[PDB]
Design a protein around this ligand. Sequence first.
Ligand SMILES: C[S@@+](CC[C@H](N)C(=O)[O-])C[C@H]1O[C@@H](n2cnc3c(N)ncnc32)[C@H](O)[C@@H]1O
Length: 449
Amino acid sequence: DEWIDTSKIMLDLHIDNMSSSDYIPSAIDRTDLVMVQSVHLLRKTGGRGLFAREDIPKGTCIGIYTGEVYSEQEFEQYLKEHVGSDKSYAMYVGGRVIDAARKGNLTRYINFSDSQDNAEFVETTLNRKKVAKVITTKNIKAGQQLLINYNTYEEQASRYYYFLNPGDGWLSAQEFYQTYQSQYRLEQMPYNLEGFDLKAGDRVLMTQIGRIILANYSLAKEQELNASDIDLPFLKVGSDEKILDFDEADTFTPLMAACYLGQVENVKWLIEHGANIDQQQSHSGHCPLSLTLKGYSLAKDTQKYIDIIQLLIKNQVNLLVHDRSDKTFLHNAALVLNNLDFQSVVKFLIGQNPIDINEYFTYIDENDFDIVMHCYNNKLFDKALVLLAFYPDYFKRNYMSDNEGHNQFNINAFRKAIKDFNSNERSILLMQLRESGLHLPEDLLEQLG
Ligand SMILES: C[S@@+](CC[C@H](N)C(=O)[O-])C[C@H]1O[C@@H](n2cnc3c(N)ncnc32)[C@H](O)[C@@H]1O
């Protein structure tokens, strides 16, 4: 312990905001692979993040989540007696609480995502007791940010966090631009784009590929294109002729614009050449799926937006992505798509023969409604049937499982979802439930109201 110099650990990690006696290493920490940097998006609160110093293969162990150790009772009493304390850095694992709000190691710097996470907490043993390891869940390029999914308790992450991307770094927008200066050119918007809060005459820094998308030309037709321009974002410029920093305005990529404008072949081109199909705008959350849906809602030709939905699904887009209301793709598609198109999109998903169909039916919105409850709350009976056909085990897996706590929660949520139904609306619901082929027991139909 006399042999452990945490001061040089922090210097090597570029950690500048911890006391050396607050740094708690584990024997399997890999400081050689990672580094702490500012996340420019978070500059207003001086937030940091953990980043890769080199390429990291999928499945690599990064370290142990260390911190102060409490029993659940001791930690509940800690929160009570320390004004301003929270569960921000607290992990409930192995019957204890590990809290890294004051003390811990490099793993305390990893930020949150539930749609672009590239690492995970895995339970491991450490001197006869249970803690968590951080393992990468996909390949990480040098300079990309480590992101992780965990229980954010009372922080209301969906409402208040940024939608972080692995390419969100320590550079400002201005520094970002000068790094790729040769690929960029200042343009004026040739028309309005309400999808990205742009008006004709707004100045936007964009690439050749960008220009081509806004011109509605074909990317395939072009023969001198640069590979960097694939995902180089449009950067908006302010009324004072200065670049809008990352936390002052959302950027958007070529793929995002192609999807919003309904450009099928350009979407297909951009997917194949490595565009991040799950990229999210930091403040708004808009992604290629959501922008495609928005395009659809305004479209003259709705079919091209459907073909783009099909293309994203064919390339395993994360359909579990959600907005700030906690509505997933299937939540919102049910509101925006007409019956034929909703049916058709569910058919695409069927064609992918998903392993865990239940995972789509498990994410609940801010109202506690999963996607089936969501349809019913919106009088979308035909949509509901399409989902029920899609997933027959829906009621069985979520209302009649081995977990009565969970079962009763879903039963109450369901009641909540239909609590405004009228004389007629509860009978049509009851009708389709029985000819469904779902074989619902009488006692379930009753406590469902
Ligand atoms: C485990 S810490 C992550 C490291 C933290 N950024 C730091 O500099 O110490 C979790 C806290 O980081 C911030 N955070 C993590 N992910 C975030 C996100 N996606 N958007 C906004 N803030 C985030 C929140 O303040 C949260 O309470």
